[PDB]
Design a protein around this nucleic acid. Structure first.
Ligand SMILES: [Zn+2]
Ligand SMILES: [Zn+2]
Ligand SMILES: [Zn+2]
Ligand SMILES: [Zn+2]
Ligand SMILES: [Zn+2]
Ligand SMILES: [Zn+2]
Ligand SMILES: [Zn+2]
Lengths: 57, 84, 56
DNA sequence: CACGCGGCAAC
DNA sequence: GTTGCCGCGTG
DNA sequence: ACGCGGCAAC
DNA sequence: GTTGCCGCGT
């Protein structure tokens, strides 16, 4: 297992993709709001890439 | 106001982080005095020194041979070598 | 240069010493537990200096 | 060899 | 605290 | 009262 | 990388 289907990061181990998908691309029931705008997310990776894009752009 | 971009910010706090992440090619980094490691923040250098180059009162043997080390960094590089 | 009546901190200005006395050496009716053991403190300074000694 | 744990280390 | 990396323990 | 500057634990 | 920290200059 090398490439991730939901994002761009590359991983070497097979198990390390399991923890990646389960931590970054798992679906969360209760949404989390962006700390700056009014957006709300259910995926950890989508929140991180968005929330970084505010004060980093 | 981020002399590099000339992009403006309301506070100086988030301006420093814009420079650290986007303009990392212009921040004076810190060379460790014991190894080839270069570190961006000085606080991270303090941790690196405390954890990697602190004299261990006791001694920790290599998991493979009968050699003892009193520093973490030297022990890790020694165990990495056992693959060559 | 003025010396705090409760610790070895030295402060230059009287106004800054007041803030130091308020924030550091004040009493807290509900105690705060140590981040690493079951110790409980009613003063911020005691908690801080204790918690830092867990690096020993 | 697959899988999951837990430590690692600069960010 | 993050996250991928890796050494190593179960099968 | 306000805001930075170096620092530190997570 | 985040965020709180505090003595200190403004
Ligand atoms: Zn992914
Ligand atoms: Zn947002
Ligand atoms: Zn810029
Ligand atoms: Zn070093
Ligand atoms: Zn050895
Ligand atoms: Zn005091
Ligand atoms: Zn304690």
């Amino acid at each position: 297992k090398f490439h991730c289907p939901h994002c761009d990061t590359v991983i070497a181990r097979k198990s390390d993709l399991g923890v990646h998908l389960r931590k970054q691309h798992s679906y969360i029931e209760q949404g989390k709001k962006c700390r700056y705008c009014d957006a709300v997310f259910h995926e950890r990776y989508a929140l991180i890439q968005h929330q970084k894009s505010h004060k980093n752009e | 106001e981020c002399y590099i971009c000339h992009a403006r910010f309301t506070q100086s706090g988030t301006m420093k982080m814009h420079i650290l992440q986007k303009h990392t090619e212009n921040v004076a980094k810190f060379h460790c005095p014991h190894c080839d490691t270069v570190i961006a923040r000085k606080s991270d250098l303090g941790v690196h020194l405390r954890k990697q180059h602190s004299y261990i009162e006791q001694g920790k043997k290599c998991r493979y041979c009968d050699a003892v080390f009193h520093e973490r960094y030297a022990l890790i590089q020694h165990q990495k070598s056992h693959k060559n």
